[PDB]
Amino acid sequence: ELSATAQEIIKSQAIATKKIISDYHQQFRYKLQDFSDQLSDYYEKFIA
């Protein structure tokens, strides 16, 4: 019983552990895209 309980607990933990990283990586990339877009208009905003 103890072995089964431990196995199911670790299985439950693993999915959420992966889920967090999966959520965060895409936003990590979108931030790079946003920053690259921002750099384009720096000179124009400055001059204007």
From Swiss-Prot:
Induction info: Up-regulated in response to enterovirus 71 (EV71) infection (at protein level).
Processing after translation: Palmitoylated; structural requirement for proper assembly of the hydrophobic core of the lipoprotein particle.
Compartments where located: Cytoplasm; Secreted; Lipid droplet
Record disease entry: Hypobetalipoproteinemia, familial, 1: A disorder of lipid metabolism characterized by less than 5th percentile age- and sex-specific levels of low density lipoproteins, and dietary fat malabsorption. Clinical presentation may vary from no symptoms to severe gastrointestinal and neurological dysfunction similar to abetalipoproteinemia. Hypercholesterolemia, familial, 2: A form of hypercholesterolemia, a disorder of lipoprotein metabolism characterized by elevated serum low-density lipoprotein (LDL) cholesterol levels, which result in excess deposition of cholesterol in tissues and leads to xanthelasma, xanthomas, accelerated atherosclerosis and increased risk of premature coronary heart disease. FHCL2 inheritance is autosomal dominant.
Function text: Apolipoprotein B is a major protein constituent of chylomicrons (apo B-48), LDL (apo B-100) and VLDL (apo B-100). Apo B-100 functions as a recognition signal for the cellular binding and internalization of LDL particles by the apoB/E receptor.
Subunit annotation: Interacts with PCSK9. Interacts with MTTP. Interacts with AUP1. Interacts with CIDEB.
Record's protein name: Apolipoprotein B-100
Species: Homo sapiens
Gene: APOB
